[PDB]
Design a protein around this ligand. Structure first.
Ligand SMILES: [Ca+2]
Lengths: 211, 211, 211
């Protein structure tokens, strides 16, 4: 089809059922929404993510370390359930019965540029500097005023997992949010549970499957 | 419709009738052209802007402060004339009678990420660091050789004005142009009137209305 | 047509028959693939490039200078063969008989923002700071692990050559890849021929021809 769309997650950002990998062997739940539009083999889309201190492990200092996490968008999860690393709930593609293949990173482009994720499925975070390749987008997130969020980066990488049973690539999205030095520490064990961050829908583009 | 387009402004960049807001309760007129294409609820587009010293406030120093200004793109201005903050003299949509709603930042995405503009129609500039959320693009502008323009940033923020009568969101575009330290001061009262800057068409993407 | 596509180069990246212009009046052969999708006057696409040390001039130091080169995408080469500066073997447009004009940078946007390339036509490299206007994209390339490739920038500029016989603009893509200070020198005369870099498909957007 000429234009196809794909979405997963909760557009109201109220279901904290999405799995994020954090640095140093950690995990957190977030609410997220993803929309992709594919035309002519080129895919443009947005990701939007939110979470609060209550879901987050209590190690490190967010002011010095940044708030870092990653999620995986997995278009072939309909035919390869093991690829659903972020534990999404099941997409809507339009028009119905457009293949999800359209939203996987291009296979020819992915050769030798793809990141192979750690194969333990509760711990697939990869620091920016060990990603094989990526594209970088700059944005500003918002959140509780005391966090003093100043900026953020998104990296978009083509990825695969050894646990996958199919040929189709995934999209790894790594996030880094930064605070002004006077912000409070998000990872502080006595920090209020209700401290939260919320990104805008961050746009990205990549090459998908084509004829 | 599958693909819809929107444009406003003068593609020949000869009508200096677009109102730009500046730092410190100043304003300037610019010529501008904006084109958006929406497919699958994702919108990609460009903005191009030009102006000359004659039209610009003689205060501060552009070399140390940068040249800063903002314009608003306002898709719902056909049904809410008060939202036309930059005072575009009309807009065209194709195919005819596609709703302008398609080009407004997505309402679910906009919740809690939107910036509320100062409520006065002639003074709505918001410094980058007070924008609630945004996406950043880096470019290089051109202009009179003696300005020695080195680079620029565009920030794209979803916004709304208290003066609006509808729920449809606007796009706030904040610009910063930077000069090499030996360039002449654009804001100097004795500067030649003809000193000008001109951006290329700067591309941006955001999430719009969908089903 | 609503959506048109354009591609040139080898998607398997095995034919090192593409010319890239280099600093100091040098040139190198690369393998490259470019895909563009045009909707509503707005063009999005990717470029992917790879090459190895064997094909590269042995001067300077890549660690301190960076690995810099440029290629030209030339949509009107079907009607203006002289505009084929990077020497693509041909291009494919879909649907067949869609005009290649759609993929040229917009003519109204291009006036006064366009870069005029040097004329002796293997060495039309323009340093970033000499380009009239551009848009900048940040990415991370990959390659031989001893290169220690850390990051890269792509600049997208509208361009023309004095040797062209038509009005249609070209796309100049300038690359800079950077290495960690401990990486080996790609330009070392003793360096293994097989050292290589490979970018991901890097996405970009620009304004093309419209009605
Ligand atoms: Ca006008």
């Amino acid at each position: 089809p000429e234009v196809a769309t794909y979405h997963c997650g909760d557009n109201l950002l109220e279901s904290y059922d999405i799995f994020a990998s954090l640095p140093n062997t950690n995990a957190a739940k977030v609410a997220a929404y993803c929309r992709l539009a594919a035309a002519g083999g080129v895919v443009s889309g947005t990701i939007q993510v939110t979470s609060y201190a209550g879901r987050w492990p209590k190690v490190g200092n967010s002011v010095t370390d940044g708030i870092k996490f990653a999620i995986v968008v997995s278009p072939p999860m309909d035919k390869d359930p093991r690829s659903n690393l972020s534990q999404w709930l099941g997409a809507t593609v339009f028009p119905a019965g457009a293949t999800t293949a359209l939203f996987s990173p291009n296979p020819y482009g992915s050769l030798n540029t793809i990141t192979t994720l750690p194969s333990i499925a509760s711990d697939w975070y990869v620091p920016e500097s060990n990603l094989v390749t990526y594209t970088k987008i700059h944005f500003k997130p918002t959140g509780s005023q005391q966090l003093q969020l100043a900026s953020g980066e998104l990296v978009v990488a083509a990825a695969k997992s050894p646990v996958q049973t199919t040929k189709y690539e995934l999209i790894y999205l790594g996030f880094t949010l930064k605070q002004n030095s006077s912000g409070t520490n998000f990872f502080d064990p006595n920090a209020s549970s209700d401290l939260s961050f919320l990104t805008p829908p961050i746009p990205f583009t990549y090459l998908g499957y084509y004829q």
